[PDB]
């Protein structure tokens, strides 16, 4: 029922993608001012000591800068350098951050790094990857790479040929079209799939691509990076180069005007997310970004061979959480993430735009938002204290958000500058808000029974308190999660357990 | 699935049937075999079997603190009907 | 116990990779003589009518050639053209071969086609893919592609840097090294993983790469193919260009001498293999080649970041079935395929060579070869009658094999020219020998109980006959599998069932 | 797993216990309650429960013809001990 379940104001505007934490990294204006927080201290709001207020200063000390907080660009570049592997994490001589775990994280992130164009931090329309030419006769790799389309290419050259040859597939109805598309998407690798109508509210108002400049590495190969790594290593500071901006013209860059969207999700490992602060949870997030990039390309090729236009997307063209809600895949939780019934927030969302007319799905309600009004568990577990502690969701206003948040929608506010400051401090994505979620459970009989109890009036509070008390996914407290030894012991068990957790 | 899961589930069902039969036999022996006195015992037996099943499932999921905590809570939730039945007989 | 379980003769020699059906496709000498079969008629051996004796003539008729059988090159090129999508299958107006199913098949084999270098038909050391340069400023794709490394690249440039910086990871023992490598491989996407010592017997004696020549397509883009597609479409015949041959020198092309091998497998969909002749089973085989290419790259990157050399491989450098046996992953069945305990033959095998010293696994025995001496079920279901009908395995001799088979090992003989003739006739891989296998079962309680019963003396025959009688995976007879309607109904149910078969 | 699998497994265990108790009660009523006459009934009950469980599992796996064939075979394998027990009592 209805197009969108949540309340959207009449002042709503499409979000500019270049304003986000990961794209505003490379705007040179973001390097001029220290990073900003909506609340300087959240100690009064939470009643607990604010650990994230000192993150800019610690990051600046890590970068070698004395007397001023780290800037947004500097903080993001510190995180980028630690993740890329050109530096060492602050906890490298600790279980969960060692060279073995870093090697696992690097291996898991490989496809995303080298064939998706590192789309985790966004991308232009089509994705571009630099690849070094090779000589088949002598198997000699050159030194200067070339730019070629990645796994998210928008190449629709053969669709017109398929249509003109008469081989375009005709569906008898939209319902059959949706059924076939969902079955194909599930076969190609998706865990859940839903179809939503093209809603321009969830498309960004400006598409942009990072500007890369060549820098020579000591191995003898020139690598394209959006910042000056050799200058940063030499201590000369952090320098960025800007963005190449594109208007969101579907006909110009994709060739078609969309009329339906295919949204699908891919689950993450349960045993790796449990060790959330460590780089094992980073490895399981890199594997998911690789998998979602691989599946999207297959779906796009399937659609194009059917004779219909397709545009595979990952974290670049629209906002995935509002579209997944509109496609009936779940509900938006307190953390701002899609809470599926089967996986909870353990998933990553990818989308594919198409001009094929499909029967859209309807939004689903199964008790996430009423549970979230009382649990407040992800907020307690944030090491940066980014998530809101307010009881009820509200129609966000410009006063209730920074430049990096889209106001005018009924929801809880998250501070993005704190979640990037803690990733710079840690050197890897943090997933604590996903790990400690009450809906972050495996699919068995007992969790399915408990999901029913989250909507029976008397059993709701019992289920919530029992989730808190039974100790699922480890301690809630961010600090306690480390020096209690839970993360270390969980990493050791992960390495010493031959099999993962499925039941 | 597995080969041990189905056997343990069958054993749990058999144990539930045995406990229900024992409760009914006890009620008949004391003479107070009314339906409510048997529904209370059924609730106690159900909660005890739920405790055991949740403990096994938590062991399968490598969540070891849930095994004892669920044991305690569901065991108390089972003991309350048992206490009521005993006080009524 | 022991290095290899099966008996290897003292006359054994390493197999030349260019002699196989898919590699000998592109040898110009293979276009001079009609394709050859070990037995012209197998009607006497099987007691049933030989349907595969007419395959060369039918393929030649499909190619437009009158009066002579199709050649090995011509037959292989006809399958290649039907699989690539430049032609139409003989059954396109039938359920299971329609444009929808072809679109699904094309979407599933997308990553293998465009980023693995189409490694299903072999490849050289490192894999090379042609990609069209793109202009990031205008999203303008050029017309002439460039050659860049694929998902199976052997680029080991940073290993020496990691070793010289002192960050190479040191294991306390080989057992811990094997444990960590297996856990990492399972996390990165593998379903089963085993470690075997480097055995030169299972490495090919010659590495080769097909020669590609540019041909212009009507869309305006030049595409590199190993055969002349425009000439073939015009009716001028089939032309190939040869191979670029490399000696198997590990130090020259990889940089290291191997000392251990990581072997892993990835399962295939149960519901799609059931429709084995149709292109749905082809789609589930293309998805598996995509997945195995994606996982191998991650494993290689993990090994290289640990500071050790790595060479990811798919269907190109060694023989996977004997190597997986050495790693303790299963047993070789009557079909010549690895029969794992969990999946049976529903899997694809990939390997990664490394110089890291790992504790090797031991071969396992759980009753496959004794079941195969009596079942003879895959032989009955071969539409080309390629699989041997002999009761016992034997030490194969030059008289018992063609040029395309490696003799001197204790096993059953398979005819490869018949299995390629039927793929040319069908237009897609056939998987019938995998679908009808008694070990091709989903992992549940009843199938584990039956697996226990395949090694109890009295229960063995009962389990075998009950597997045959209960109708698992549809009819055994290849012809009956189609006109009885089983394949059509199974495809319709597959399209009309929202969820796949997992229990 | 699921929510129906565990319920059906517990129900099958309860049914097996009920059949065993009925067999023992029948033997005691006829007076021939020896252990072999009870082990034969146990084998019959086991094979009947195996038939039902295999039918359910085959229904789950979308292998529908195996449901009837398994019923026939395991039902005969269960009927043989039942026939022996009846002829001996
Ligand atoms: C429009 C504006 C910026 N939104 C964006 O542009 C999101 C960009 C992007 C690529 C996401 C991919 C994408 N294409 O969407 C992604 N991230 Co990032 N992320 C970030 C970036 C935020 C930048 C920002 N300005 O918010 C961060 C560094 C903070 C970031 C960090 C995380 N990220 C994470 C994840 C997983 C995700 N992140 C997402 C949201 C996404 C969808 C990525 C993906 N996968 O495709 C993940 C969500 C998966 C899911 N389960 O739903 C995570 C947990 C860290 C990790 N393990 O990797 C952490 C989550 C913290 C958090 N709870 O926010 C980024 C860059 C992204 O929204 P916002 O600032 O109000 O955030 C807001 C959030 C509210 O808190 O819900 C929002 N929303 C928007 N419209 C509507 C709503 C919400 C409701 C209720 C509506 C009715 C409508 C929207 O998601
Ligand atoms: C040495 C000689 C050439 N062997 C090779 O070079 C293998 C080549 C390659 C790439 C395989 C990948 C790889 N890197 O190995 C592959 N194919 Co091709 N294939 C073929 C090619 C034949 C190659 C040939 N002319 O012999 C065919 C078109 C016939 C072919 C067809 C199939 N292929 C198929 C598959 C799945 C495989 N094929 C394999 C064997 C492999 C391993 C590919 C992969 N995956 O990575 C698949 C096996 C998976 C598994 N479960 O083990 C399949 C089923 C079609 C499909 N589903 O798409 C079909 C199987 C038919 C069959 N039973 O042969 C090819 C090209 C390959 O082998 P052979 O003729 O003796 O075959 C023989 C086979 C027994 O007949 O096992 C043998 N073997 C070798 N050493 C030892 C043994 C056996 C025993 C018992 C020993 C003790 C030692 C060896 O495999
Ligand atoms: C009788 C029902 C009884 C009250 C069930 C309570 C069990 C306890 C442990 C609930 C814990 C609990 C579990 C186990 C979930 O799987 C879950 C999934 C999604 C949302 C919430 C929850 C949740 O609160
Ligand atoms: C009591 C044991 C009883 C004889 C079990 C027989 C069941 C029948 C249906 C066996 C069929 C059968 C099944 C069901 C398998 O899963 C399987 C897997 C691997 C190899 C063989 C088999 C097999 O023969
Ligand atoms: S990922 Fe989640 S828990 Fe971690 S800092 Fe960001 S918002 Fe907080
Ligand atoms: S931890 Fe609690 S409040 Fe936060 S997203 Fe999960 S259920 Fe909602
Ligand atoms: S794939 Fe197997 S069944 Fe099919 S033709 Fe080849 S050998 Fe025969
Ligand atoms: S069908 Fe039978 S003989 Fe053939 S590989 Fe399978 S078990 Fe062995």
Numbering used by the authors:
A (entry chain B), C (entry chain A): 49 to 551
B (entry chain C), D (entry chain D): 1 to 89
Paper text:
The major players in this process are respiratory reductive dehalogenases, corrinoid enzymes that use organohalides as substrates and contribute to energy conservation. The key enzyme in this dissimilatory pathway is the reductive dehalogenase (RDase), a membrane-associated protein that is facing the P-side of the cytoplasmic membrane after transport via the Twin-arginine translocation (Tat) system. The active site of RDases has a cobalt corrinoid cofactor that mediates halogen elimination or substitution, and two additional iron-sulphur (FeS) clusters for intramolecular electron transfer. Here, we show the structure of a menaquinol:organohalide oxidoreductase (MOOR) complex isolated from D. hafniense strain TCE1 as a dimer of heterodimers (PceA2B2).
A subset of the data containing 34’078 particles was retrieved, from which the 3D refinement produced a C2 map with an overall resolution of 2.83 Å. The large PceA subunit has a globular shape structured with α- and β-folds, while PceB has three TMH predicted to be fully integrated into the lipid bilayer, thus acting as the membrane anchor for the complex. Unexpectedly, electron density for two menaquinone molecules was also observed, each at the interface between PceA and PceB subunits. Finally, density for a dichloroethene (DCE) molecule, the final product of PCE dechlorination, was observed 5.3 Å away from each of the two active site cobalt atoms. In our structure, the catalytic site is 8.3 Å apart from the proximal FeS cluster, that is 9.9 Å away from the distal FeS cluster, which in turn is aligned with the menaquinol hydroxyl groups with distances shorter than 12 Å. This organisation forms a conductive redox path between the menaquinol pool and the active site. In the PceA C-terminal domain (S486-Q551), two α-helices predicted to be embedded in the membrane (α17 and α18) lay close to each other at a 53° angle, and bind a menaquinone molecule between them. Interestingly, in the quinone-binding site, three polar amino acids seem to stabilise the quinone head, due to their proximity to the molecule polar groups: K489 (at 3.7 Å), H495 (2.5 Å), R499 (5.4 Å) and D515 (4.5 Å). In contrast, we think that these residues, together with conserved residues in PceA (H495, D515, Y520), could be involved in the transfer of protons from the MKH2 oxidation to the P-side of the membrane.
